Symmetry: C6
Subunit: 124 residues, 6 copies
């Protein structure tokens, strides 16, 4: 999470992760209940690309996480071809820039692509 007590990253807290997992204990990845829960968790904790990586591993199986990671990679290259806000194309990979706590605007764009990447899942 990118804390806001100068943007500062702080690792996931197990008590926060446990609250998220139990809210989606009966929700397949991509389902409406799933998306609603992770959308609020993204809003609350303002996670970096690395944090979102960790959150996906914690909540979904390898097959699902593997597929989401792939879908997002395509979403990123599509978005880059399609135009992104706050994206300095000379500042390195989008995933690396989304780990810079300063680039909040970019990070928020990355979060939406990460959330959208779940669309490739049946949701059931």
């Amino acid at each position: 999470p990118v804390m806001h007590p100068p943007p500062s990253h702080r690792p996931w807290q197990m008590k926060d992760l446990q609250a998220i997992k139990q809210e989606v204990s009966q929700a397949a990845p991509g389902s409406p209940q799933f998306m609603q829960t992770i959308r609020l968790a993204v809003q609350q904790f303002d996670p970096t690309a690395k944090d979102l990586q960790d959150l996906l591993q914690y909540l979904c199986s390898s097959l699902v996480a593997s597929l989401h990671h792939q879908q997002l990679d395509s979403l990123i290259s599509e978005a880059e071809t399609r135009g992104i806000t706050g994206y300095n194309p000379l500042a390195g990979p989008l995933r690396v820039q989304a780990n810079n706590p300063q680039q909040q605007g970019l990070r928020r764009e990355y979060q939406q692509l990460w959330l959208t990447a779940f669309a490739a899942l049946p949701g059931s």
Copy 2:
């Protein structure tokens, strides 16, 4: 939530949302138990228009949320024709002004319209 530790907005906390949802787990949107719970949550967290948007999505299904959003839109235009306190008609849409943490008086007026918009629901 508009925190009061200069009015400052801070996103919804999942632990707060979870406490609200479980209090209305057996209460249809608009029912007496529902309204009592969200009235106290509005009082405690002083939510902005955007926060109230998020809270509605979290607690109600799309059909209910869609209808509430519509009812409130009519309530807003009715209230604007009917006279509102703290409303600068030149300062943009009421929903935008209700997101300015400074305009507390207006925000409180918006919260009551948001709460009243549940009246269009059978409550059962």
Copy 3:
């Protein structure tokens, strides 16, 4: 609640309200268990007249709350005829003065009348 970290009012916290309600989940309004619980809650949170209004609505049904509000109104007029401590009769209605965080002495008197107003209930 009138917080004591200059007397400052802060709204009810849902986690505090939920703890009170579950302690009286099996206690009719006015019963010994009910009174014992709200007496300690009044002591802990030092609520204003408005706070006590909200607490009554949250814990009791409309019929009970309606009757308590009435009983207290008579208790207030009786107490005013009967003599009250810290009551400036020129400073407005007792209920308004009991919302001024400065008038702690008066507020404590109001709390006892609010607690006593439950006597009109069978307690079962």
Copy 4:
């Protein structure tokens, strides 16, 4: 409780009271489990005479509380005839001095008499 963040009294917190009650939910007043629990609560919260009064009312029925209050009154007069530490016999009733957060030594003596007063109970 007499807090130690100059000795300062702060009222009982419902979350603390609830933890005490549930630890003795299956323990009659005066039983070994009862005494063990309240002895640690007295140690943790350093309660005044008034606090101990409130704690007794919260945990025991009127018949038990009535009897404990009586037993302690005799224990106090016995202790006064028998010699007490920190007791200024000219400074008012022992119960009043035990409410002065400054008189910690005396307060601790009062707590032990309050705890001992449970001996008049069968403990079962």
Copy 5:
């Protein structure tokens, strides 16, 4: 517990004691699960000799506590004959020195003897 926010002692917190007891709810004194739990509690709270006295009373029956207290008394005299670190033999009883928050090194030695004293128990 000897807090480390100058070494300062603060009494046991009931919420901490309750967490310890429920971890060993199904573990006889001296069993592997018992020792593992209290070893971590000693590490976390850095208890004094008096604190360890209180913890033993809270977790074990009188027969067990009586025997542990005895075993430790022999362990102390054995350790004193056997050589101890941080032990000023002229500074009073080991138990008294282990209550001085300054003598951390000694206190840690006392904790290990207190833990070892459980060896006289069958553990089942």
Copy 6:
């Protein structure tokens, strides 16, 4: 845990340990659920070599802990022959350097070897 409020070590908190254990209550050491949980706990608490020692003892039986400790000892000597980052070969044993809160880079390397040492377990 190496806290980050100058790197400072603070002992394990029982409430944190209890949350970890209950997340792996139905997960054999080395299983996917086990590794996922301890990987996030290592990330959150940044434990030293001594902390990881304690965590292993708390979560696994002696046979498992004994084997893990052995496997890691071989992993350490293998890694030392194989090249390590932040490792000053003249500054003492890797385990000792991994207890120095300053040597964060080294500590992170040690954590990964500690995590990898679970590979010798069947995971079921």
